[PDB]
mmCIF file of C-alpha atoms in Angstrom:
data_model
loop_
_atom_site.group_PDB
_atom_site.id
_atom_site.type_symbol
_atom_site.label_atom_id
_atom_site.label_comp_id
_atom_site.label_asym_id
_atom_site.label_seq_id
_atom_site.Cartn_x
_atom_site.Cartn_y
_atom_site.Cartn_z
ATOM 1 C CA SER A 1 27.815 22.939 25.730
ATOM 2 C CA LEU A 2 25.081 23.761 28.388
ATOM 3 C CA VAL A 3 21.102 23.382 27.729
ATOM 4 C CA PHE A 4 18.789 25.527 29.913
ATOM 5 C CA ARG A 5 15.425 25.445 29.893
ATOM 6 C CA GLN A 6 12.763 27.538 31.552
ATOM 7 C CA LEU A 7 10.392 25.872 33.872
ATOM 8 C CA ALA A 8 8.761 28.537 35.241
ATOM 9 C CA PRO A 9 8.516 32.666 34.908
ATOM 10 C CA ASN A 10 11.945 32.892 37.447
ATOM 11 C CA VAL A 11 12.679 29.225 37.805
ATOM 12 C CA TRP A 12 15.346 27.330 34.873
ATOM 13 C CA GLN A 13 16.480 24.157 34.483
ATOM 14 C CA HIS A 14 20.754 24.159 33.592
ATOM 15 C CA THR A 15 21.727 20.778 31.742
ATOM 16 C CA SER A 16 25.396 19.522 31.358
ATOM 17 C CA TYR A 17 27.048 16.642 30.432
ATOM 18 C CA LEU A 18 29.654 14.180 31.152
ATOM 19 C CA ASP A 19 30.921 11.116 28.785
ATOM 20 C CA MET A 20 30.485 8.505 31.074
ATOM 21 C CA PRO A 21 33.176 5.259 29.939
ATOM 22 C CA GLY A 22 30.487 2.601 28.684
ATOM 23 C CA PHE A 23 27.542 4.805 28.657
ATOM 24 C CA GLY A 24 28.349 8.256 26.550
ATOM 25 C CA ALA A 25 27.151 11.542 27.416
ATOM 26 C CA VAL A 26 25.181 11.245 30.525
ATOM 27 C CA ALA A 27 23.370 14.200 32.002
ATOM 28 C CA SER A 28 23.117 15.843 35.014
ATOM 29 C CA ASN A 29 20.651 18.957 35.989
ATOM 30 C CA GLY A 30 20.794 22.029 38.491
ATOM 31 C CA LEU A 31 18.388 24.683 39.182
ATOM 32 C CA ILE A 32 18.516 28.532 38.197
ATOM 33 C CA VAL A 33 15.888 30.847 40.572
ATOM 34 C CA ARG A 34 15.911 34.433 40.753
ATOM 35 C CA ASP A 35 14.232 35.713 43.460
ATOM 36 C CA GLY A 36 14.008 39.333 42.891
ATOM 37 C CA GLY A 37 16.970 40.933 42.488
ATOM 38 C CA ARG A 38 19.003 37.837 43.066
ATOM 39 C CA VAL A 39 19.705 34.430 41.693
ATOM 40 C CA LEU A 40 19.990 31.339 43.159
ATOM 41 C CA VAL A 41 21.377 28.238 42.358
ATOM 42 C CA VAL A 42 20.709 24.499 42.964
ATOM 43 C CA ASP A 43 24.522 22.045 42.445
ATOM 44 C CA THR A 44 26.893 22.535 40.160
ATOM 45 C CA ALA A 45 27.246 21.143 36.399
ATOM 46 C CA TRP A 46 29.279 18.653 35.794
ATOM 47 C CA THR A 47 33.081 20.929 36.663
ATOM 48 C CA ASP A 48 34.175 23.578 37.096
ATOM 49 C CA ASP A 49 34.540 24.876 33.772
ATOM 50 C CA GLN A 50 30.920 24.059 32.816
ATOM 51 C CA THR A 51 29.739 25.607 36.387
ATOM 52 C CA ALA A 52 31.439 29.097 35.029
ATOM 53 C CA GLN A 53 29.595 28.509 31.783
ATOM 54 C CA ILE A 54 26.469 28.500 34.210
ATOM 55 C CA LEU A 55 26.629 31.584 35.371
ATOM 56 C CA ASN A 56 28.327 33.538 32.255
ATOM 57 C CA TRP A 57 24.908 32.181 31.550
ATOM 58 C CA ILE A 58 23.300 33.664 34.142
ATOM 59 C CA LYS A 59 25.364 37.478 34.109
ATOM 60 C CA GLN A 60 24.209 37.518 30.129
ATOM 61 C CA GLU A 61 20.605 36.480 30.020
ATOM 62 C CA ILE A 62 19.681 37.445 33.818
ATOM 63 C CA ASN A 63 22.465 39.800 35.140
ATOM 64 C CA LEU A 64 21.757 39.839 38.067
ATOM 65 C CA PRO A 65 24.093 39.129 41.411
ATOM 66 C CA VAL A 66 24.054 34.944 42.385
ATOM 67 C CA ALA A 67 23.628 35.476 45.884
ATOM 68 C CA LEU A 68 23.884 31.899 46.547
ATOM 69 C CA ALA A 69 24.149 28.111 45.718
ATOM 70 C CA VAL A 70 22.698 25.162 47.278
ATOM 71 C CA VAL A 71 24.343 21.692 46.936
ATOM 72 C CA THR A 72 22.051 18.642 46.881
ATOM 73 C CA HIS A 73 25.015 15.697 47.677
ATOM 74 C CA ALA A 74 28.124 15.319 48.068
ATOM 75 C CA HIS A 75 28.786 13.593 44.140
ATOM 76 C CA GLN A 76 30.610 15.045 40.946
ATOM 77 C CA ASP A 77 27.578 15.392 39.084
ATOM 78 C CA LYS A 78 26.546 18.548 42.254
ATOM 79 C CA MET A 79 29.796 18.944 43.503
ATOM 80 C CA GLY A 80 31.902 19.218 40.399
ATOM 81 C CA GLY A 81 31.669 22.392 39.988
ATOM 82 C CA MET A 82 32.261 23.925 44.060
ATOM 83 C CA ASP A 83 36.109 25.880 43.173
ATOM 84 C CA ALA A 84 33.893 27.934 40.438
ATOM 85 C CA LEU A 85 31.441 29.247 42.698
ATOM 86 C CA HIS A 86 33.672 30.190 45.195
ATOM 87 C CA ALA A 87 35.834 31.655 42.660
ATOM 88 C CA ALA A 88 33.053 33.907 41.812
ATOM 89 C CA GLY A 89 32.237 34.933 45.634
ATOM 90 C CA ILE A 90 29.074 32.691 45.478
ATOM 91 C CA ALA A 91 28.346 31.265 49.137
ATOM 92 C CA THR A 92 27.367 28.138 48.672
ATOM 93 C CA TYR A 93 25.679 25.740 51.701
ATOM 94 C CA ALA A 94 25.342 21.855 51.794
ATOM 95 C CA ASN A 95 24.118 19.738 54.182
ATOM 96 C CA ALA A 96 26.469 19.302 57.462
ATOM 97 C CA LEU A 97 26.752 15.108 56.305
ATOM 98 C CA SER A 98 27.869 16.703 52.647
ATOM 99 C CA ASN A 99 30.192 18.434 53.716
ATOM 100 C CA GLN A 100 31.987 15.847 55.739
ATOM 101 C CA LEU A 101 31.686 13.762 53.048
ATOM 102 C CA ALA A 102 32.735 15.729 50.168
ATOM 103 C CA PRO A 103 36.479 15.484 51.471
ATOM 104 C CA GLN A 104 37.162 12.100 51.834
ATOM 105 C CA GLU A 105 35.512 11.778 48.281
ATOM 106 C CA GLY A 106 37.980 14.468 46.761
ATOM 107 C CA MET A 107 34.872 16.564 46.658
ATOM 108 C CA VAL A 108 35.158 20.356 47.582
ATOM 109 C CA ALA A 109 32.952 21.726 50.749
ATOM 110 C CA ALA A 110 30.274 23.775 50.514
ATOM 111 C CA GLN A 111 31.698 26.974 52.788
ATOM 112 C CA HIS A 112 28.582 26.609 54.643
ATOM 113 C CA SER A 113 26.633 23.014 56.541
ATOM 114 C CA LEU A 114 23.356 22.476 56.558
ATOM 115 C CA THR A 115 21.109 20.950 59.873
ATOM 116 C CA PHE A 116 17.801 19.615 59.939
ATOM 117 C CA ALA A 117 15.264 19.518 62.591
ATOM 118 C CA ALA A 118 13.782 15.770 63.453
ATOM 119 C CA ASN A 119 10.842 16.255 60.527
ATOM 120 C CA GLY A 120 13.775 16.718 57.831
ATOM 121 C CA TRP A 121 12.902 20.252 57.603
ATOM 122 C CA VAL A 122 16.366 22.860 57.446
ATOM 123 C CA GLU A 123 16.958 24.992 60.338
ATOM 124 C CA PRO A 124 16.431 28.451 59.628
ATOM 125 C CA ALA A 125 20.214 29.915 61.415
ATOM 126 C CA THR A 126 21.488 27.570 58.986
ATOM 127 C CA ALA A 127 19.712 28.851 55.763
ATOM 128 C CA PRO A 128 19.732 32.175 55.604
ATOM 129 C CA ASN A 129 17.772 34.768 53.417
ATOM 130 C CA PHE A 130 16.909 31.350 51.050
ATOM 131 C CA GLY A 131 14.303 33.436 49.600
ATOM 132 C CA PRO A 132 11.801 30.760 47.976
ATOM 133 C CA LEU A 133 14.217 28.187 48.420
ATOM 134 C CA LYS A 134 12.567 25.474 50.694
ATOM 135 C CA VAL A 135 15.393 23.306 51.817
ATOM 136 C CA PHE A 136 14.403 19.481 53.546
ATOM 137 C CA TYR A 137 16.299 16.252 54.481
ATOM 138 C CA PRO A 138 14.117 13.261 53.444
ATOM 139 C CA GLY A 139 17.017 10.857 55.098
ATOM 140 C CA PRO A 140 18.782 8.290 53.327
ATOM 141 C CA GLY A 141 18.257 7.055 50.921
ATOM 142 C CA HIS A 142 20.580 7.315 47.270
ATOM 143 C CA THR A 143 23.815 8.700 49.236
ATOM 144 C CA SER A 144 22.881 9.071 53.060
ATOM 145 C CA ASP A 145 23.274 12.508 52.242
ATOM 146 C CA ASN A 146 21.171 13.970 49.764
ATOM 147 C CA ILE A 147 18.673 16.591 50.659
ATOM 148 C CA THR A 148 15.792 18.543 48.133
ATOM 149 C CA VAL A 149 14.181 21.554 47.588
ATOM 150 C CA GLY A 150 10.710 22.949 46.805
ATOM 151 C CA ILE A 151 10.590 26.014 44.880
ATOM 152 C CA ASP A 152 8.333 28.091 46.751
ATOM 153 C CA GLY A 153 5.382 29.904 44.291
ATOM 154 C CA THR A 154 5.941 27.311 41.736
ATOM 155 C CA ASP A 155 4.869 23.634 41.318
ATOM 156 C CA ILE A 156 8.250 22.490 41.251
ATOM 157 C CA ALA A 157 10.462 19.922 43.964
ATOM 158 C CA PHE A 158 13.800 18.929 42.974
ATOM 159 C CA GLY A 159 14.454 16.123 44.387
ATOM 160 C CA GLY A 160 17.950 15.971 43.001
ATOM 161 C CA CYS A 161 19.127 12.221 43.416
ATOM 162 C CA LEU A 162 16.913 10.103 45.488
ATOM 163 C CA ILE A 163 13.781 10.689 43.112
ATOM 164 C CA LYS A 164 14.122 8.758 39.993
ATOM 165 C CA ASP A 165 11.743 9.283 36.610
ATOM 166 C CA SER A 166 8.594 6.959 36.635
ATOM 167 C CA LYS A 167 10.391 4.981 33.534
ATOM 168 C CA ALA A 168 13.429 3.825 35.263
ATOM 169 C CA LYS A 169 13.862 -0.104 35.427
ATOM 170 C CA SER A 170 16.037 0.506 38.979
ATOM 171 C CA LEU A 171 16.910 3.170 41.098
ATOM 172 C CA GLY A 172 20.627 2.858 40.199
ATOM 173 C CA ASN A 173 23.894 2.432 41.413
ATOM 174 C CA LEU A 174 23.196 1.148 45.209
ATOM 175 C CA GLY A 175 26.832 1.623 46.942
ATOM 176 C CA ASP A 176 25.746 4.827 48.930
ATOM 177 C CA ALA A 177 22.142 4.210 48.758
ATOM 178 C CA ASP A 178 20.778 3.249 52.344
ATOM 179 C CA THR A 179 18.467 0.412 50.900
ATOM 180 C CA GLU A 180 16.374 -0.320 54.236
ATOM 181 C CA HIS A 181 15.831 3.578 54.318
ATOM 182 C CA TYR A 182 15.404 4.635 50.846
ATOM 183 C CA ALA A 183 11.321 4.034 50.189
ATOM 184 C CA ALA A 184 10.534 6.506 53.271
ATOM 185 C CA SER A 185 12.913 8.742 52.250
ATOM 186 C CA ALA A 186 11.147 9.375 49.005
ATOM 187 C CA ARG A 187 8.444 9.024 50.632
ATOM 188 C CA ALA A 188 9.374 11.318 53.126
ATOM 189 C CA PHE A 189 9.801 14.096 50.066
ATOM 190 C CA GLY A 190 6.867 13.350 48.829
ATOM 191 C CA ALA A 191 4.644 14.302 51.701
ATOM 192 C CA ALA A 192 6.962 17.703 52.491
ATOM 193 C CA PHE A 193 6.147 19.091 49.109
ATOM 194 C CA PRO A 194 2.473 17.518 48.525
ATOM 195 C CA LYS A 195 1.427 20.048 46.192
ATOM 196 C CA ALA A 196 4.325 20.127 44.248
ATOM 197 C CA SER A 197 3.444 18.839 40.328
ATOM 198 C CA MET A 198 6.467 19.345 38.596
ATOM 199 C CA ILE A 199 9.300 16.691 39.622
ATOM 200 C CA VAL A 200 12.728 17.457 38.471
ATOM 201 C CA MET A 201 15.896 14.870 39.296
ATOM 202 C CA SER A 202 19.845 14.706 38.965
ATOM 203 C CA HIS A 203 19.363 12.859 36.158
ATOM 204 C CA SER A 204 16.575 12.563 34.341
ATOM 205 C CA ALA A 205 14.220 14.890 32.411
ATOM 206 C CA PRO A 206 11.669 16.799 34.617
ATOM 207 C CA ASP A 207 8.761 13.961 35.375
ATOM 208 C CA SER A 208 5.103 13.908 37.612
ATOM 209 C CA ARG A 209 4.348 12.749 40.924
ATOM 210 C CA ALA A 210 4.434 9.559 38.740
ATOM 211 C CA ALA A 211 8.425 10.031 39.337
ATOM 212 C CA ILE A 212 7.409 9.676 43.361
ATOM 213 C CA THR A 213 5.536 7.332 43.743
ATOM 214 C CA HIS A 214 7.130 4.696 41.483
ATOM 215 C CA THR A 215 10.316 5.255 43.084
ATOM 216 C CA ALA A 216 9.169 4.534 46.591
ATOM 217 C CA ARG A 217 7.532 1.339 45.298
ATOM 218 C CA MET A 218 11.124 0.531 43.581
ATOM 219 C CA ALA A 219 12.070 1.196 47.076
ATOM 220 C CA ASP A 220 9.830 -1.217 48.696
ATOM 221 C CA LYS A 221 10.711 -4.555 47.062
ATOM 222 C CA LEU A 222 14.794 -3.100 47.557
ATOM 223 C CA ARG A 223 13.596 -3.048 50.982
ATOM 224 C CA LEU A 224 12.596 -6.353 51.718
ATOM 225 C CA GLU A 225 15.322 -8.261 48.948
ATOM 226 C CA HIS A 226 17.945 -6.832 51.154
ATOM 227 C CA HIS A 227 16.391 -7.777 54.526
ATOM 228 C CA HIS A 228 13.791 -9.446 54.652
ATOM 229 C CA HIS A 229 15.532 -12.862 54.365
ATOM 230 C CA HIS A 230 16.963 -14.963 57.177
#
């Protein structure tokens, strides 16, 4: 029941669905990147079973070992299949912040913690041999730990749950959101990958840079609508 879509010669988007009460089948997107003789993964599927299916798909269609996976935040849709990756002996990385949040929120932490420089770029020491994956922390947005990934050599940039599609009417649930800094975070992602033309998101189909601008704008409204009164 998994859907795979090739976005570039060496990049595929994996999509899995989870039936959410009141909403029905909700999609979640992640990435699969072929880097020479290795395969890198961005985010798990909704569940361990689906995540295991993703691995079987890789084995069948690419037949190359999966060297590592990066999970962009501590949420079901992105860290629901942590046990499956570990069972396959795949090294996992997540924002140190995400790893600290995983427990309290019943999520399984990644094995490795990523830390970031003041400008948002990941500290090399914590992200060994990530190949074309350029990990960037834009600052608190949808969640305080959300991170993003650019795929060097392509026009693709993964915004995770931070960026919403250009047709969205709102920023979604703001339970863990930082309404004051969301806008700056969205813009930081845009400036970090200035030439990316295909923006991939956790819950929306691929879109143009119009999604970044649209998201930042809704975020501007949200910011003064929640913090700029008396």
